[model samples]
Target: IRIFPRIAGRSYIIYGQTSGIICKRMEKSDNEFVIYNYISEHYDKFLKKYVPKLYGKNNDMLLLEDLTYNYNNPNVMDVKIGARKRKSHTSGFFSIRGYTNSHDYKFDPDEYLTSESTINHIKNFMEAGGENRDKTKQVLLKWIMKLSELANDLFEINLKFDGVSLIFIYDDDCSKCDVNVVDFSRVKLIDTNDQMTISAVTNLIKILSELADNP
Candidate 1:
């Protein structure tokens, strides 16, 4: 005598939520033996249709249902929204970089420089360029080298699953610039299990933050 009846029209989310309760029933057979026996008899069929299974010979794995037509290259760049712009400023001898539109920096006591400071730095650097062209170039080169080293360290830790794409906003005047370093084929998806991935990404961000302080 069959006790389990086929359940239809149940949503996948609902089924997943109730799977644990359903599995527990098999532990004791005394209460509602008919329902227990029925489920046990058709366990394979029920699980195959509803449950998420690990790789096993008898288990049927669940997969995402595709809604749209498959495209050649689906993955895209990871876009960061609302990133603050760093501006350059100058003091008498020293140039600094800071965010012009940031309230956090303006209000914070420990913040290094403001957007005005960065603009001043650039102006001073340019003004002194006639007398200190070589020195200015050396300073700029040091800055660029530091940036490259930080980028190399970052790439070492994080696997680029999606290709790296950078969008540069020249000013609030709507001018934009962009660059993509790795081609789609070369972009490798990052595995969360990678040990150094998080550290590398974090360090790279820190370096960028430091640059922004004086840019």
Candidate 2:
């Protein structure tokens, strides 16, 4: 059976069966497939690890490993990274775009959610038992490192992630936590160079660092 969770925000991805593959539907002009092919096939290990694995592409769909499927009853959050032109001041650096509580199958976009609320939501996802404190701290630290590496990698290639997000996933006990950089359809080439994405990543790193210190 194929599961199309509302947590994905966009209904394009369809997770199917035990094979652990998800079919992401895209438009005729969608550039995500190209980006996937480039990163997954390129020699840059860091860039490859940051994005999803591309098994194949056909028509307007791309096959990917279901990263969220690795967890049991995964609670997932999507935080969009980049400097916004419209609502730049709304969330400062990143937007807690949406999240899903797998236990209850509850999804909330939390439109224009603030940083403080974002932290609260993350803490809630990890729950209050604090048994997973050490694990959570480690996970947050790893995430911060990965995001920082991604930003530096993009900068090296003059590529700016326009609508990319950091997707976070963990299970009921917080035993498994995963973070991946997703959505490359809106990537842009900066001939003159830019710092919006880098700056946003820095801010995100700070937030994750703070979380790691107190998780």
Candidate 3:
């Protein structure tokens, strides 16, 4: 009951990303699996207008509704590098690490979303050899808080923004992007009313905040 490469003959864009396929494959009854699936489906439905679509999931990969179809590619410079398959993470400044999209679904070879931050920050630090390192860290804390707020009322468990790019979106007419859980291995559900939740939500909130100003 995972994602498909193509739908017979119809053409569709999928937010294709391959993990450990990073995280563990659940049996529709595991603890984190249930929570992960729960928030994923519920928030997806609730935030459908704000995020990308999750097509299907299998043992090897996840076929999602691609977000690139919503915007045009920025000049390569404006387009920083990012990747999936957590274990293959190469976002570090000096790392040539990057992942490829599995075209088995379809390859629009046409996207790199503009996320929320400095330049935005987190991206700057991870990329341009420590350009906005400190500022970037601050911005990340902001976005992490946003994630918690997104799911705070629905569940009491805590979630982490362990991955660098959770919200990779494009700002174009049809150029949309997705803040997917490509690195689900980095996230978690902490059942505590104490510390971890505070940092998690605070950081997530920073991401959507405007050190500048926005809509």
Q: Which sequence of candidate numbers ranks them by TM-score, best first?
A: 2, 3, 1
lDDT per residue for candidate 2 within 44-135, as digits (tens), equals 58556776677777688778778776776777777777544356524667776766653452435545556776667666666622565777
Better of 1 and 3 by TM-score: 3
What does candidate 1's lDDT look like per residue over 1-215, in tens digits? 21111111111211122222111121222322332233336344432332222221112212222111122212111111111123211221112222223332342213344556544433332332234344434434443454355344444433332312221112122122111221122223354322332333343344335544443
Candidate 2 contains a number of clashing pairs equal to 0
* 1 versus 3: better lDDT goes to: 3
Question: Please, what is the TM-score per model?
Answer: 0.21, 0.82, 0.38
For candidate 2, report its TM-score.
0.82
List CA RMSD, all candidates: 23.8, 3.2, 11.8
Candidate models: Cα lDDT each: 0.28, 0.68, 0.34
Best candidate according to lDDT: 2
By lDDT: ranked, best first = 2, 3, 1
The global Cα lDDT (0 to 1) of model 2 is 0.68
lDDT of 3 by residue, 1-215 (tens): 33422211122223335431211243232343343466565444433433335455565344444443444541011111122224432222111112122223232223332333222433332332224444444433443444555445424434442432333432322122233323233344445432432443343344435431332
Q: Indicate which candidate wins on TM-score.
A: 2
lDDT of 3 at 194: 27
